[PDB]
Design an enzyme around this catalytic site. Structure first.
Site, PDB file in Angstrom:
ATOM      1  N   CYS A  73      -0.364  -5.079   7.419  1.00 27.40           N
ATOM      2  CA  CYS A  73      -0.488  -3.812   6.753  1.00 27.40           C
ATOM      3  C   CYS A  73      -0.525  -3.829   5.263  1.00 27.40           C
ATOM      4  O   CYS A  73      -1.296  -3.110   4.691  1.00 27.40           O
ATOM      5  CB  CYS A  73       0.604  -2.788   7.163  1.00 27.40           C
ATOM      6  SG  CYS A  73       2.186  -3.563   7.293  1.00 27.40           S
ATOM      7  N   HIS A  74       0.244  -4.488   4.479  1.00 27.02           N
ATOM      8  CA  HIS A  74       0.009  -3.853   3.058  1.00 27.02           C
ATOM      9  C   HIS A  74       0.913  -2.721   2.446  1.00 27.02           C
ATOM     10  O   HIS A  74       1.465  -2.907   1.355  1.00 27.02           O
ATOM     11  CB  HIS A  74      -1.390  -3.308   2.947  1.00 27.02           C
ATOM     12  CG  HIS A  74      -1.673  -2.699   1.621  1.00 27.02           C
ATOM     13  ND1 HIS A  74      -1.583  -3.419   0.440  1.00 27.02           N
ATOM     14  CD2 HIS A  74      -1.970  -1.429   1.274  1.00 27.02           C
ATOM     15  CE1 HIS A  74      -1.815  -2.611  -0.578  1.00 27.02           C
ATOM     16  NE2 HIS A  74      -2.052  -1.397  -0.097  1.00 27.02           N
ATOM     17  N   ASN A 119       2.070   5.702  -7.952  1.00 27.89           N
ATOM     18  CA  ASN A 119       2.615   5.703  -6.577  1.00 27.89           C
ATOM     19  C   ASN A 119       4.009   6.276  -6.417  1.00 27.89           C
ATOM     20  O   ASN A 119       4.325   6.849  -5.378  1.00 27.89           O
ATOM     21  CB  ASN A 119       2.525   4.324  -5.930  1.00 27.89           C
ATOM     22  CG  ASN A 119       1.079   3.917  -5.640  1.00 27.89           C
ATOM     23  OD1 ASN A 119       0.725   2.765  -5.804  1.00 27.89           O
ATOM     24  ND2 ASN A 119       0.247   4.852  -5.264  1.00 27.89           N
ATOM     25  N   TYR A 154       0.145  -7.455 -15.063  1.00 28.62           N
ATOM     26  CA  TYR A 154      -1.040  -8.143 -15.528  1.00 28.62           C
ATOM     27  C   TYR A 154      -0.885  -8.527 -16.975  1.00 28.62           C
ATOM     28  O   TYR A 154      -0.300  -7.788 -17.736  1.00 28.62           O
ATOM     29  CB  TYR A 154      -2.295  -7.301 -15.334  1.00 28.62           C
ATOM     30  CG  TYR A 154      -2.719  -7.364 -13.908  1.00 28.62           C
ATOM     31  CD1 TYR A 154      -2.290  -6.408 -12.997  1.00 28.62           C
ATOM     32  CD2 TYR A 154      -3.467  -8.454 -13.439  1.00 28.62           C
ATOM     33  CE1 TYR A 154      -2.619  -6.501 -11.667  1.00 28.62           C
ATOM     34  CE2 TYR A 154      -3.824  -8.557 -12.108  1.00 28.62           C
ATOM     35  CZ  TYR A 154      -3.415  -7.582 -11.237  1.00 28.62           C
ATOM     36  OH  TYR A 154      -3.745  -7.702  -9.908  1.00 28.62           O
TER      37      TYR A 154
END
Lengths: 234, 234
Positions: free
Chosen positions: A120-121, A151, A183
């Protein structure tokens, strides 16, 4: 009692200090820590982060799109396989609020043709006690700079919507991560954001009594008291 | 630097102080908190709890049984649907250690005939950086008194076994919970256990070089320096 946003900022600070270099599937560099969790109260406030302006219109509009099941993430929530995972969560909360299996899952669509039964993730587990609905989101990876603040708002918003139709009050949103990463190109922006002091979270108001998850519209929702620091482009 | 076991004890203390009364599916009472996480280093030590004697023989023997795929939990790990989830995790670590999808899932067998596509129940996500293997276990509920101390050991043990066959060093085990609960009848025993000071964790030694997950035997493993407080019956 501490501002909930201090967890996110403490987590960004921890990855910058202690995160390890790890590439993603494009070979783009990140600093990475495995296993993180934060809890944001949803009680009389809404965790829309304030150390930068979060794109609330895009949060709401995308969630309403997912809920429509239109195409992808919404298709899976509503046509799993289908199984309407979202209505099942609502119906379970209504028929057995004690249930430990009030879980909805989502897959990265790129994984579906890649192998049999892909993992799933993201999963959301819902929880009810004392007429309050909590939600825990587990994501196998979280982009701490761009994806995580957006989110926190989306799933906090989903919990408000489900609490509303089930006649419960929002409780906590718990965000759990597998690979929590920043990042490389977000490091300088985040360091500046870490200099900013959180302001009190806004409130979210639902302006209408809505009975079915599919009947919500963007105008039913109103963010009050949102007074964030300026936008950080990442 | 604090003893890892202080997290578990702090978590027990938090549920006793702040947990809410919530019944399980038999209508048996618990005190419950939603959303918990702890991290246990696996580096030069092994998180077999010391404030009570943990039944290590049963931990090892049951894990070896699950790995055999014999019948249930092991059947799902090895014959999912089947898909050998366990070998796939091993093979993925070996072919792409950066992968964010190194995930294995397990279902409560009672859920399987109850509905279409039931939610899982427990997932393990593996993570590799700098030649260290970490594992995060998410369980939708955890019996803090009986199940949690045993499962910290089982999944820490699984991580050691997989690190061994993939030529990695064990990193961290992260235990994340949905409904973390204490059964009412365990409250008095746990209060006494909370009075006990942790001792340094033991080490786990693998006595042989083993190449395939299925080749491990109970005699390949040796716990050294385990000096726990007495057994607490729950």
């Amino acid at each position: 009692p501490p501002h909930g946003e201090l967890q996110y900022l403490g987590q960004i600070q921890h990855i910058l200090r202690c995160g390890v270099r790890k590439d993603d599937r494009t070979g783009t560099g990140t600093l990475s820590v495995f296993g993180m969790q934060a809890r944001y109260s949803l009680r009389d406030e809404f965790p829309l982060l304030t150390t930068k302006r979060v794109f609330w219109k895009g949060v709401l509009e995308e969630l309403l799109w997912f809920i429509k099941g239109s195409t992808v993430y919404g298709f899976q929530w509503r046509h799993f396989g289908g199984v309407d995972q979202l209505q099942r969560v609502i119906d379970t909360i209504k028929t057995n609020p004690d249930d430990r299996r009030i879980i909805m899952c989502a897959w990265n669509p790129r994984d579906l043709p890649l192998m049999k039964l892909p993992p799933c993730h993201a999963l959301c587990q819902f929880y009810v006690v004392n007429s309050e609905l909590s939600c825990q989101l587990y994501q196998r990876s979280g982009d701490m700079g761009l994806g995580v603040p957006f989110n926190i708002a989306s799933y906090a918003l989903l919990t408000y919507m489900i609490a509303h139709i089930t006649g419960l009050k929002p409780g906590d949103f718990i965000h759990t991560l597998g690979d929590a990463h920043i990042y490389l190109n977000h490091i300088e922006p985040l360091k500046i954001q870490l200099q900013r002091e959180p302001r009190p979270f806004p409130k979210l108001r639902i302006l209408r009594k809505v009975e079915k998850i599919d009947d919500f519209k963007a105008e039913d929702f109103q963010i009050e008291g949102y007074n964030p620091h300026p936008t950080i482009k990442m």
